[PDB]
Structure formats: structure tokens, C-alpha cells
């Protein structure tokens, strides 16, 4: 219980795992305000497992990320666990906290939702 979202305590656990593993890939996503005042509390507890680089932590981070596959390493595969411990966990090895930021776009049309852009700093 950090903050509920209208999801039924079972969907909210598997919704943040759909925003985290699509933020280490695209490096920025466009979403609503309250879906991105909580995913800054997940992906900053997950680059911390990137700065360790253990065997326990390569397993203990895999239970909050999906298994997707990335193609353009000039035609070389890169699983989203391997994009961390890698080009993500080496960009921030001397910044102690504060990996994300939230940029408010505007209210979206026809729903009135305060859209924001989260992006890795």
C-alpha cells in the first residue's frame, strides 16, 4: 500500500511491471499523472539492483520485470534484463538517487487526464 489506482490489488502489481519494463527500453513513456507518481518508486528501486551486479540480484530483479526481447543492437538480441546490468546500470554509477523526472504535458482530449512524460535522467 503505497497508493491504489482503481485496480483490484492484483492488477496493480502486474501493471507496474508493464510500465517498468517498457521504460528501460523506450527511455520515455507518455502516461497519466498518477500512473507516473508511482513508477518513479519502482524503477529507482531497480537500477539499485543494477549497481550491485550480483548473482542474487540478477535473479532478484527478474521477479519485477518481463521477458521481452530487443532487436537493434545492429542485429543482436538483448533481453530487457540484459539491457540493465549494461548500458542502463553504467550510465548511472555515480548518481546516488533521482534517476527519473516528470514533465507535465497537458490534459488529454476527451478524458481530462493530466498527461505527463516520465523519462530517465
Amino acid at each position: 500500500g503505497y497508493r491504489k489506482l482503481g485496480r483490484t490489488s492484483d492488477q496493480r502489481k502486474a501493471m507496474l511491471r508493464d510500465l517498468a519494463t517498457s521504460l528501460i527500453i523506450s527511455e520515455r513513456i507518455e502516461t497519466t499523472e498518477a500512473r507516473a507518481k508511482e513508477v518513479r518508486s519502482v524503477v529507482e528501486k531497480l537500477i539499485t539492483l543494477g549497481k550491485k551486479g550480483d548473482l542474487a540480484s540478477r535473479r532478484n530483479a527478474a521477479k519485477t520485470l518481463r521477458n521481452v526481447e530487443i532487436l537493434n543492437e545492429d542485429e543482436t538480441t538483448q533481453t530487457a534484463l540484459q539491457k540493465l546490468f549494461g548500458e542502463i546500470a553504467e550510465r548511472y554509477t555515480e548518481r546516488q538517487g533521482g534517476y527519473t523526472r516528470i514533465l507535465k504535458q497537458g490534459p488529454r482530449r476527451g478524458d481530462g487526464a493530466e498527461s505527463v512524460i516520465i523519462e530517465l535522467v
Binding site: R101, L103, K104, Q105, G106
Partner: protein, 53 residues
């Protein structure tokens, strides 16, 4: 439960004194030179100017 009387035109217009919308709270985006809603980015060319976004 139903109304007992037909509510008049004096009592109707009084009840929507407080039924209105408020001004947006705009600023002047100092690089492009437009209006934008404050603490938000510009929809045109425009920086955040504490962040240059």
C-alpha cells in the same frame, strides 16, 4: 421523492450563482513568446526554462 411545486425562475437563477468555471492560470512562455499553462511545457517550440524542455 417528487417536487411539491414548480421551482420558479427567481429560485432557479440564484442556485447557479456558484455554477461556473475558473480562469486557466496562464503564463507567457519567455522563449517562444506565447501563452502556456503554468508548470507545463509548451505545445509549440518551447523550453521549460528551469529544465530547457
Amino acid at each position: 421523492a417528487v417536487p411539491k411545486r414548480r421551482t420558479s425562475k427567481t429560485r432557479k437563477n440564484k442556485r447557479r450563482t456558484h455554477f461556473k468555471i475558473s480562469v486557466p492560470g496562464m503564463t507567457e512562455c519567455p522563449n517562444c513568446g506565447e501563452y502556456k499553462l503554468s508548470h507545463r511545457v509548451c505545445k509549440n517550440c518551447g523550453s521549460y526554462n528551469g529544465e530547457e524542455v
